[PDB]
């Protein structure tokens, strides 16, 4: 209940700050003021066109490595096990195959931002 | 007395707006060279609380420092309009004041006051960085003199 | 009183002036911030002919230069008379927001106007404002106007996009004049 | 040592502007606490101290008057309140006050 | 009494970040052969308050081409996540004691990244889009590196708590056992806080203002508060994890003082880094992390798997 | 983020400088050149003055020439400070900007002492030099220059071996020597790509032929090599400043020809011919004999050229100003191939670009 | 002559000690720590900032500031309506309408200088044969309107009467050079 | 000089000392001169609940010793 | 110039170079602002004889 109250208090504080920011000052709104910025000229495009990012393979690899992270994270409770040899071998194999995947992608130029 | 409380509140908001002046990272010419010489360690505008911000949304005063070309003028007007409401203009140098050396040119706006409302005119070609700092402090005094809450209360 | 003190004073009576930063088109466009549009008698039996700011100012300048108008009264009106319902429907069509009207009697509408007018700042609306909204314009019959002061009255259907484009969302921001059908013009 | 000498110069600067009221006055008007040789006291009330141990640029300064030509310049200090002769000396066109 | 505890956590943190802005301006000035603000306050101490009042009395200036819901949600989200991230830190007793404190920290940091992304996409401008995409790349790289670093360090520790970190560092720091992890964690905290060298989300030179280029005053101040609160928090987390303050059961005041001194030193180190170095390119940051830190931290994670097994120094569960 | 095409629209600082120059007299058209490249004011003044001197068939006195070389190297230090520090500011580091701008403030104080203005010092003239130096100026220039190499060393240590700066500048905007020659860069990009060319060594104009210095030469043609070239040019400018301070000659300040240079004020107030020549030079100006010349001077940003056409009157018929930044920005699109926004910013920084001289 | 800035002479080969030194430079971030030390030294230096409105920046007697019209020690105006300062004015900022005075002296009736048009080049003060127009040391004369910078003869004579105690001293210190 | 940053540094120092010290003191005040008695596991929570039932004032921090046994 | 010995040692070690020899603040080694009056030389063609303008 305590953490819930602190979360709600922080949310209410941020809402109070932005409500003060919006209801305190004086408003004078017109079209040239609220136009998009674009460094002092009218934008050619609509800023919603396709962007064509260059690190898409790195993003998918990040998804896979994040799930490898999720696999690796119960290690602080895994080291409390009674066997510890199969645990050590399994952790070594997991880190080794993750590193092998990273090395293969590096060799095949996956993380090189193909334009 | 409501007049006294309103006057003190107005003095407080004027103190805030004059102690936190954020000019825009926007110059045009040799006058902007002197403007960053005013940013230099000698006449520290950051010591005065004056610090550049690149976006006009986070700017407070446009320091028009340079020659306002005809091709440049829509950009300057758009950039000024994109500022939030308590905005000021310091024209700097003869070009921004009244055209200066290029007054009779076919491509120069004869003074930036034809385009934007100018609060403070700083003369020189270039005005020294000391002179631009003088204009900045004169602008601070000018917005110290403003009485928005008192005019509202007697409105 | 102005006639009594200054007997040759030009008196200019415009209609509800529209333009940028007005309190007529922007008022009806700011009706979108509530649930519906509370009009009296569904916006019918109320006829308006709004007039442009540039037309009014040009009329004033031509009045201060004109060899005539040495004591005359002018009626500065727009070229088209609209019903209030059709005008508000056209405004919300140009805004592309939505349009749900609502019949509200003038008694409780004046109550709501007084409630809004109870404000230390500039009120959003007041009882006098809603009364002037629901008072119909008169037919300018014998008075001179912009036409013989040398000003062509620009129609609202022409100079309306420069006011109401602020109040659109991003979806409908880049819409032309032809995307909105013009309001029906009454004669009466 | 050096630190105790720095502290001695600091307490000299603190107790060198008259009293606590004078120290607070110069600290909230001129935003510095320094002791210089008085060379000025012009007719309008400006003070014009100097100190040659400081580097070039900070070696001459003015404490402005709190009143000039009917204007309460306690906080609204101005760069044009210097008369021309002290203006020349303060901008270091000559070494002679 | 708990609301009083919330106030005594929240209000000092906000005053600390405002004076962090002051300290940043003065330290950068004195490293730039100039001063900081010394006019607004007696020694510039009223300058952050003047800046805050000016920002909250300027208009917020809602734009036309803008998704307003996300445009408003994002800065409030950033500030509330910064304070929520401040919640579970022990000095030496936390306000809220969590078993999985580090996991909570990681989740809240990722949600702060989402606040930046939603602001950048909602403010429908090209420079905002550029800043959002740069934020995506940056958080990919530092997220994978930070997860591995914390895994290895807390494998040297016991559970995922932080009082356990205090009891682990009761005798000696964790900097001496794992200093390469401390270096990579310092660089990763820089990347998480979007600070120089590799800020790249509010890039003043490559972009105009990045994701804040359409945010006028108000919510812009909220974003700034969230960023600087995150700066102090990442330095505080670094000194809790690695530079363990002295803990005694009888009195915790010296623990709080030691934590304060080391957190101040690391915050000043952040300002020092900003004064010293130029900016990376945001592809160079990804290349640097994924080609230097990630292989080294994978190897060091394997080494810290093997270390308690072959030294028999497995930490206790509690 | 990858850049597919650069198209720099210029002309937002075009003020019709050449048309105004052809509408004014030569002495009246002199302070336009202070505002063409407003970082090397004395250098542009020297270029225009040498063009008018060549048309007039007169030479400035040796003291004027040595003063012009001394202030030419002072402008070179000012311009390379500005270029290096603003390039580093665009990259992301600002402390060298603040340090070297304190030094730049000292040199602007030197300008304000030798003339009236700190920047647009209408000082170098077709009649040699307008006014002689005040008596403490050479000693103060020496005191500045003896401490200046430490500041270059501080910036050099901050940037040169820094791996972030190296990753930001190395193999960025690589220009081959043949492409630089074909694009007509001609200023610093040539010696950054390895072309051994400097006008002060190949076509010397003032006493540069009798000062001694080295021309730094790059080998990779990238931003890092150009930055190294600018730093080494600052050091060689310090070397030339030392030589000029040692070998300043005791002569007169302007060419002793009252039909070109104005006489001294005492002679003007005591003499008839001097007053007549003062009146005519300050109302009509000297008549330049008709002809066209192209005078090129190694300005810090590059080869600064003036094509002057005189029709025989006291006003120039035509004055074309060739700015190096024009050719550099024309070549910006070629240099920005296979790069992103950040290194495009780096390439803009590494090209010594001021838009007053580009737009005119 | 010339020199190389990035070319290396031969190579230092491959050695275990040199390899260890390069490895420590890469891993321990030695040049980064060196840059940290440099800016730390700058932190512990003394700043060059002057307290502005109390400590003004240094200047020179040649400094071009605000224009002024001077007088003889008798009080008579120095200007003799000869117009060659506006002839040499490269910005055409001066207007010198003139007529004979009541005593028959050649004086000006309109002497306007547009400070928003003037480029502050001193050509008028170096062209004036009687030292009438000068550019005195005033630079803190920024105004809140464009019109206040359109000076006339009364304003210029007022500036000359205001700044004569400094302008005369500067001309005394400077006139042997010019 | 460089010591001009020390006012801001000291304000940050007191603002970082205050939360931890206040949290410890508030924990002591609320728990009656002892610490928070954190419960990481169900056994510790069971001990806290048993103490709350034993005390009789529905407060786990009211420790009961040998005075309850005759 | 007015710095303690410990601070000077720290500055020199942190910079790697000696700073008190070439510090960038000017104290007293600069020229005096008030200078003695000059006597500028006249150049050639002030000869009063053999100085016709057609020969130069
Ligand atoms: C502080 C601002 C208020 C006082 C200002 C004042 O009166 O200054 C006069 C005066 C300085 O004027 P100055 O004569 O121009 O400076 C002498 C040197 O040029 C100063 O040059 P310096 O850097 O060589 O001298 C600094 C000196 C003294 O520095 C200190 O004592 C700073 C604190 C060190 C701990 O440092 C040391 O002795 C070694 C310190 C090593 C630290 C590691 O004396 C001081 O500032 C004394 C130090 C005061 C320290 C106050 C610390 C607490 C601040 C408030 C916290 C709440
Ligand atoms: C030759 O060619 C040319 C160029 O090419 C080279 C040009 O360039 C050019 C253009 C030239 C110019 C535009 C010149 C401009 C100058 C420069 C570019 C150089 C100057 C230097 C810089 C721009 C870099 C500055 C570097 C710094 C280190 C300064 C630091 C700046 C910052 C923005 C970071 C610090 C932050 C701030 C200043 C603001 C921080 C404060 C806040 C946001 C406050 C927020 C806090 C709160 C909301 C707290 C509130 C909470 C509370 C609890 C408080 C309680 C309150 C109460 C009232 C009780 C021209 C024309 C040109 O010709
Ligand atoms: C840092 C945390 C806290 C941040 C928030 C700041 C808290 C402290 C605020 C103190 C000042 C409160 C009033 C600020 C008003 C700022 C805007 C303003 O002056 O508007 C003038 C306007 C004046 O209105 P008006 O009637 O002149 O009309 C405005 C339209 N014109 C001028 C074009 C005709 O509004 C007010 O005066 C409103 C005052 C509200 C006072 C509330 C208390
Ligand atoms: C049962 C209760 C749970 C909630 C469901 C009922 C209420 C919401 C219904 C869905 C509304 C969707 C909608 O209107 O979207 C339009 C808007 C987009 O509209 P917009 O912002 O583009 O345009 C509005 C423009 N003006 C204001 C000028 C008219 O989208 C949202 O509101 C979605 C934002 C996120 C909402 C949830 C946030 C949760 C916290 C995140 C951290
Ligand atoms: C929190 C505690 C304090 C931490 C340090 C904080 C103070 C110092 C801050 C310095 C400035 C940091 C600012 C950001 C800098 C960003 C650049 C950067 O760091 O890039 C990383 C750089 C990258 O260098 P790089 O990118 O130049 O490398 C070139 C690589 N190519 C050519 C492919 C581009 O360095 C590293 O990645 C090193 C990481 C740390 C390595 C630590 C190794 C320790 C030793 C291990 C064991 C050795 C023995 C082996 C076994 C022996 C058995 C007997
Ligand atoms: C089981 C395996 C995993 C164990 C854990 C370690 C994880 C390492 C993951 C990454 C390994 C990738 C290796 C292959 C590779 O991709 O190398 C690429 C690299 C050149 O790429 P790059 O640096 O980007 O260069 C750009 C142009 N020059 O190539 C090079 O730089 C060449 C390097 C050659 C030497 C490799 C190291 C040998 C070490 C031997 C130690 C013996 C004790
Ligand atoms: C509370 C209501 C009154 C607020 C202050 C009104 C009076 C005022 O502004 O006084 C000016 C004084 C000094 O400010 P200033 O005039 O800029 O000084 C220049 C000196 N170089 O200003 C000050 O001393 C600053 C006063 C700040 C008051 C507290 C602000 C909130 C924290
Ligand atoms: C602007 C809109 C913002 C919306 C987003 C808000 C984000 C909030 C901050 C980030 C939260 C990330 C997720 C954190 C989950 C809680 C972490 C955790 O470990 O909780 C478990 C903990 C007790 O577990 P344990 O530590 O094991 O203790 C047992 C013995 N001590 O504690 C608990 O069991 C407590 C469980 C509740 C804790 C979270 C409460 C959240 C409340 C809702 C907030 C949003 C409401 C909707 C929007 C409102 C209007 C804007
Ligand atoms: S007024 Fe002079 S210095 Fe300023 S921009 Fe114009 S030409 Fe340059
Ligand atoms: S200084 Fe130059 S531009 Fe100004 S009035 Fe005199 S001659 Fe004209
Ligand atoms: S000020 Fe001098 S130059 Fe100008 S008209 Fe008068 S006397 Fe002639």
């Amino acid at each position: 209940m305590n953490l819930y109250t602190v979360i709600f208090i922080n949310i209410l504080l941020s809402l109070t700050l932005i409500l003060v920011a919006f209801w305190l000052p004086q408003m004078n709104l017109y079209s040239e003021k609220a136009n998009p910025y674009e460094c002092g000229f009218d934008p050619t495009s609509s800023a919603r066109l396709p962007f064509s990012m260059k690190f898409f393979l790195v993003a998918i690899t990040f998804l896979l490595f994040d799930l490898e992270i999720a696999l690796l994270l119960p290690l602080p409770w895994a080291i409390q096990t009674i066997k510890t040899s199969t645990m050590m071998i399994m952790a070594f194999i997991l880190v080794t195959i993750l590193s092998l995947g990273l090395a293969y992608e590096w060799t095949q130029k996956g993380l090189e931002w193909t334009e | 007395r409501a007049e006294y409380v309103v006057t003190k509140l107005d003095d407080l908001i004027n103190w805030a707006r004059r102690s936190s002046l954020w000019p825009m990272t926007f110059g045009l010419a040799c006058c902007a060279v002197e403007m960053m010489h005013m940013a230099a360690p000698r006449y520290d505008m950051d010591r005065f609380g004056v610090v550049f911000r690149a976006s006009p949304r986070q700017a407070d005063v446009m320091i028009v420092a340079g020659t306002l070309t005809n091709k440049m003028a829509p950009a300057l007007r758009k950039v000024y309009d994109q500022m939030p409401e308590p905005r000021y203009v310091v024209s700097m140098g003869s070009c921004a004041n009244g055209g200066g050396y290029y007054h009779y040119s076919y491509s120069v706006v004869r003074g930036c006051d034809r385009i934007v409302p100018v609060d403070i005119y700083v003369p020189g070609c270039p005005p020294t960085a000391e002179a631009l700092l003088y204009g900045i402090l004169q602008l601070q005094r000018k917005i110290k003199r403003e009485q928005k809450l008192k005019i509202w209360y007697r409105r | 009183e102005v006639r009594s003190v200054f007997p040759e004073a030009i008196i200019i009576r415009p209609s509800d002036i529209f333009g940028r930063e007005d309190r007529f088109l922007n008022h009806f466009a700011n009706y979108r911030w509530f649930l519906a549009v509370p009009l009296v008698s569904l916006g019918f039996k109320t006829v308006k002919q709004p007039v442009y700011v540039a037309d009014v100012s040009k009329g004033i300048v031509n009045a201060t230069k004109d060899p005539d108008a040495v004591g005359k009264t002018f009626a500065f009106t727009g070229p088209n008379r609209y019903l209030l319902f059709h005008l508000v429907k056209y405004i919300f069509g140009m805004t592309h927001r939505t349009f749900i009207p609502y019949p509200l009697p003038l008694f409780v509408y004046s109550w709501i106007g007084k409630l809004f007018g109870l404000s230390p700042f500039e009120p959003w609306t007041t009882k006098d404002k809603v009364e002037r909204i629901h008072i119909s314009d008169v037919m300018p019959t014998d008075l001179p106007g912009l036409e013989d002061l040398g000003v062509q009255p620009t129609p609202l259907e022409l100079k309306s996009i420069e006011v109401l484009r602020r109040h659109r969302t991003y979806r409908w921001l880049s819409s032309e004049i032809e995307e909105t059908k013009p309001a029906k013009t009454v004669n009466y | 040592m050096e630190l105790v000498e720095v502290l001695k110069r600091g307490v000299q600067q603190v107790t060198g502007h008259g009293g606590l009221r004078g120290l607070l006055r110069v600290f909230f008007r001129a935003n510095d606490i320094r002791i210089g040789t008085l060379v000025g006291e012009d007719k309008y009330g400006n003070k014009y101290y100097e100190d040659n141990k400081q580097f070039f640029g900070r070696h001459r300064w003015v404490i402005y008057t709190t009143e000039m030509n009917g204007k309460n310049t306690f906080w609204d200090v101005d760069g044009s309140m210097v008369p021309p002769e002290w203006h020349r000396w303060l901008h270091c066109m000559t070494d002679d006050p | 009494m708990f609301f009083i505890n919330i106030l005594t956590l929240l209000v000092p943190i906000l005053i600390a970040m405002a004076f962090l802005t002051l300290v940043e301006r003065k330290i950068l000035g004195y490293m730039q052969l100039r001063k900081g603000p010394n006019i607004v306050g007696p020694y510039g101490i009223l300058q952050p308050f003047a800046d805050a009042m000016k920002l909250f009395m300027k208009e917020p200036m809602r734009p036309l081409t803008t998704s307003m819901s996300l445009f408003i949600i994002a800065p409030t989200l950033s500030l509330t996540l910064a304070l929520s991230l401040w919640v579970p830190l022990p000095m030496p007793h936390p306000l809220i004691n969590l078993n999985l404190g580090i996991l909570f920290i990681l989740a809240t940091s990722s949600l702060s990244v989402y606040s930046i992304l939603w602001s950048g996409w909602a403010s429908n401008s090209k420079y905002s889009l550029f800043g959002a995409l740069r934020a995506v790349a940056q958080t990919i790289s530092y997220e994978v590196t930070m997860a591995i670093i914390l895994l290895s360090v807390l494998l040297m520790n016991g559970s995922y708590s932080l009082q356990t970190l205090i009891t682990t560092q009761e005798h000696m720091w964790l900097l001496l056992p794992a200093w390469p992890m401390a270096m990579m964690w310092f660089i990763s905290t820089l990347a998480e806080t979007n600070r120089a060298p590799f800020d790249l989300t509010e890039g003043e030179s490559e972009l105009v203002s990045g994701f804040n280029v359409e945010y006028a005053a108000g919510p812009f101040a909220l974003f700034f508060m969230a960023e600087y609160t995150n700066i102090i928090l990442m330095n505080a987390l670094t000194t809790i994890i690695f530079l363990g303050p002295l803990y005694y059961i009888n009195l915790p005041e010296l623990y709080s003082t030691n934590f304060m001194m080391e957190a101040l030193l690391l915050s000043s180190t952040f300002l020092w880094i900003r004064a010293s170095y130029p900016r990376f390119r945001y592809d160079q940051l990804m290349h640097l992390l994924w080609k230097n830190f990630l292989p080294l931290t994978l190897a060091l994670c394997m080494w810290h798997i093997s270390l308690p097994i072959f030294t028999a120094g497995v930490p206790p569960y509690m | 983020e990858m850049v597919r095409k650069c198209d720099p629209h210029i002309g937002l600082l075009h003020r019709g400088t050449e048309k105004l120059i052809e509408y004014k007299t030569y002495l009246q058209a002199l302070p336009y050149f202070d505002r063409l490249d407003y970082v090397s004011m004395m250098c542009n003044e020297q270029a225009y003055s040498i063009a008018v001197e060549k048309l007039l068939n007169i030479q400035p006195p040796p003291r004027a020439q040595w003063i012009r070389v001394l202030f030419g190297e002072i402008t070179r230090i000012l311009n390379h400070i500005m270029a290096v520090t603003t390039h580093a500011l665009d990259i992301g580091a600002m402390t060298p900007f603040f340090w070297m701008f304190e030094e730049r403030e000292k040199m602007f104080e030197f300008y304000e002492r030798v003339s009236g203005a700190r920047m647009h010092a209408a000082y170098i003239r077709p009649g040699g030099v307008h006014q002689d130096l005040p008596l403490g100026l050479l000693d103060d220039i020496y005191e500045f220059s003896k401490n200046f190499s430490l500041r270059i060393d501080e910036v050099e240590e901050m940037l040169t071996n820094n791996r972030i700066w190296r990753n930001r500048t190395v193999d960025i905007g690589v220009v081959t020597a043949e492409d630089a020659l074909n694009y007509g860069f001609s200023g610093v990009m040539l010696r950054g790509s390895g072309i051994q060319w400097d006008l002060r060594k190949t076509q010397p104009y003032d006493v540069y032929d009798q000062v001694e210095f080295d021309v730094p030469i790059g080998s990779r043609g990238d931003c890092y090599d150009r930055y190294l070239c600018r730093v080494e040019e600052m050091r060689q400018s310090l070397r030339i400043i030392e030589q000029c301070l040692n070998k300043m000659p005791p002569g007169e300040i302007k060419v002793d020809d009252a039909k070109v240079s104005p006489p001294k004020r005492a002679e003007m107030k005591t003499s008839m011919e001097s007053l007549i020549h003062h009146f005519k030079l300050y109302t009509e100006g000297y008549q330049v004999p008709p002809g066209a010349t192209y005078t090129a001077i190694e300005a810090p940003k590059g080869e600064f050229g003036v094509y002057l056409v005189s029709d025989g009157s006291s006003r120039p018929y035509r004055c074309k100003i060739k700015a190096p930044g024009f050719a550099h920005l024309a070549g910006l699109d070629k240099m920005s191939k296979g790069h992103m926004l950040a290194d495009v910013v780096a390439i803009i920084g590494t090209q010594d670009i001021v838009f007053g001289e580009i737009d005119r | 002559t010339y020199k190389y800035v990035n070319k290396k002479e031969q190579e230092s080969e491959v050695d275990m000690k040199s390899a260890t030194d390069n490895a420590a430079r890469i891993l321990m971030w030695t040049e980064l720590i060196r840059g940290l030390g440099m800016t730390l030294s700058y932190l512990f230096r003394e700043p060059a900032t002057i307290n502005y409105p109390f400590e003004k920046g240094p200047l020179s007697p040649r400094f071009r500031g605000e224009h002024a019209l001077r007088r003889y020690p008798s009080g008579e105006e120095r200007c003799i309506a000869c117009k060659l300062c506006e002839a040499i004015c490269p910005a055409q900022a001066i207007t010198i309408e003139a007529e004979p005075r009541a005593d028959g002296s050649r004086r000006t009736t309109r002497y306007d200088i547009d400070m928003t048009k003037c480029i502050y080049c001193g050509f008028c003060q170096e062209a004036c044969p009687v030292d009438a127009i000068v550019e005195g040391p005033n630079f803190e004369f920024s105004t809140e309107t464009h019109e206040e910078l359109l000076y006339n003869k009364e304003k210029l004579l007022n500036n000359g009467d205001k700044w004569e105690a400094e302008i005369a001293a500067n001309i005394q210190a400077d006139y042997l050079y010019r | 000089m460089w010591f001009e940053i020390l006012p801001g540094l000291a304000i940050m120092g007191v603002c970082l000392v205050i939360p931890g010290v206040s949290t410890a003191y508030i924990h002591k005040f609320t728990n009656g001169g002892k610490e928070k008695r954190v419960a990481r596991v169900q056994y510790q929570w069971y001990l806290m609940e048993r103490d709350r039932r034993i005390s009789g004032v529905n407060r786990y921090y009211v420790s009961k010793g040998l005075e309850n046994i005759d | 110039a007015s710095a303690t010995r410990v601070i000077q040692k720290l500055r020199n070690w942190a910079s790697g170079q000696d700073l008190q020899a070439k510090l960038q603040l000017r104290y007293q080694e600069i020229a005096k602002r008030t200078q003695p009056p000059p006597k500028l030389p006249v150049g050639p063609s002030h000869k009063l004889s053999n100085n016709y303008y057609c020969t130069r």
Side-chain angles (χ1 to χ4, degrees), chain C residues 1-15:
Chain C
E1 293 284 343
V2 170
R3 282 300 195 190
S4 79
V5 171
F6 207 115
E8 57 274 6
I10 324 168
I11 291 180
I12 286 176
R13 302 194 274 188
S15 179

Side-chain angles (χ1 to χ4, degrees), chain B residues 1 9 42 45-46 48 57 61 64 71 84-85 99-100 103 107 110 119 124 128 132 143:
Chain B
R1 182 73 176 277
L9 284 183
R42 207 191 196 90
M45 45 181 291
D46 180 54
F48 279 91
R57 271 79 158 97
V61 41
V64 185
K71 200 174 184 175
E85 173 61 25
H103 183 86
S107 65
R110 278 156 278 275
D119 271 296
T128 61
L132 181 62
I143 76 185

Side-chain angles (χ1 to χ4, degrees), chain E residues 134-185:
Chain E
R134 289 177 157 193
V136 168
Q138 181 161 353
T139 186
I140 282 174
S141 44
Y142 79 71
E143 259 297 323
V144 59
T145 310
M146 256 178 71
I148 286 283
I149 291 168
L150 287 175
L151 169 69
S152 60
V153 172
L154 299 168
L155 197 58
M156 173 167 285
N157 198 31
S159 55
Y160 278 100
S161 178
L162 298 150
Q163 295 184 331
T164 67
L165 270 175
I166 298 178
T167 60
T168 296
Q169 305 181 87
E170 179 171 355
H171 280 297
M172 200 250 316
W173 283 358
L174 283 189
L175 174 68
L176 303 189
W179 61 275
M181 257 65 57
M183 299 168 68
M184 283 182 283
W185 168 260

Side-chain angles (χ1 to χ4, degrees), chain F residues 106-197:
Chain F
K106 286 189 188 61
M107 318 178 69
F108 272 180
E109 179 183 336
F110 289 150
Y111 279 11
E112 190 270 341
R113 208 188 309 173
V114 85
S115 69
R118 317 202 313 171
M119 292 190 51
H120 299 340
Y123 190 60
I124 299 178
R125 302 202 179 176
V129 156
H130 174 238
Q131 218 172 350
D132 206 321
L133 319 168
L135 289 189
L137 189 65
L138 291 191
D139 301 322
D140 284 338
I141 287 172
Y142 166 71
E143 291 301 321
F144 160 74
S145 50
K146 63 175 290 299
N147 295 348
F148 185 62
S149 51
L150 185 58
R151 321 269 77 89
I152 307 184
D153 293 333
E154 293 165 343
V155 176
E156 177 86 6
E157 176 260 16
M158 183 59 63
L159 296 179
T160 288
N161 299 326
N162 197 330
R163 79 185 61 184
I164 306 168
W165 178 263
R166 287 190 62 94
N167 292 326
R168 205 71 181 274
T169 51
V170 162
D171 286 316
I172 297 301
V174 179
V175 189
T176 74
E178 190 61 38
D179 274 353
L181 280 186
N182 197 24
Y183 278 63
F185 285 163
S186 80
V188 196
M189 257 72 61
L190 299 203
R191 60 183 67 107
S193 302
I195 298 165
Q196 305 171 351
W197 187 255

Side-chain angles (χ1 to χ4, degrees), chain F residues 6 86 129 131 157 176 226-227 232 258 271 281 287 311 357:
Chain F
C6 296
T86 48
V129 156
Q131 218 172 350
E157 176 260 16
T176 74
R226 288 180 277 265
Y227 153 79
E232 190 61 37
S271 177
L281 287 184
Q287 295 84 5
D311 56 338
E357 67 172 2

Side-chain angles (χ1 to χ4, degrees), chain G residues 14-80:
Chain G
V14 269
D15 184 54
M16 184 55 69
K17 177 175 152 294
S18 180
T20 317
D21 287 330
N22 281 13
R25 176 194 66 86
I26 293 181
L27 292 182
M28 305 296 179
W29 311 335
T30 60
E31 69 271 6
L32 307 183
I33 300 303
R34 195 180 247 199
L36 278 184
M38 175 92 264
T39 174
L40 180 72
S41 67
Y42 260 89
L43 161 71
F44 283 111
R45 287 179 208 198
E46 165 162 4
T49 300
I50 66 181
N51 196 13
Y52 152 69
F54 313 98
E55 316 158 343
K56 312 298 201 60
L59 286 179
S60 170
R62 314 206 175 174
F63 177 75
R64 298 177 225 150
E66 191 186 14
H67 294 67
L69 285 176
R70 292 219 300 155
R71 293 165 172 271
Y72 288 106
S74 60
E76 174 62 38
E77 296 154 10
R78 279 176 177 260
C79 178
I80 54 192

Side-chain angles (χ1 to χ4, degrees), chain F residues 230-252:
Chain F
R230 290 198 180 86
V231 171
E232 190 61 37
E233 276 180 40
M234 259 185 301
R235 303 186 177 278
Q236 301 308 310
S237 305
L238 221 45
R239 185 176 175 189
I240 304 169
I241 280 178
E242 170 191 0
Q243 290 181 1
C244 288
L245 293 179
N246 288 333
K247 301 171 63 182
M248 178 72 60
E252 79 276 7

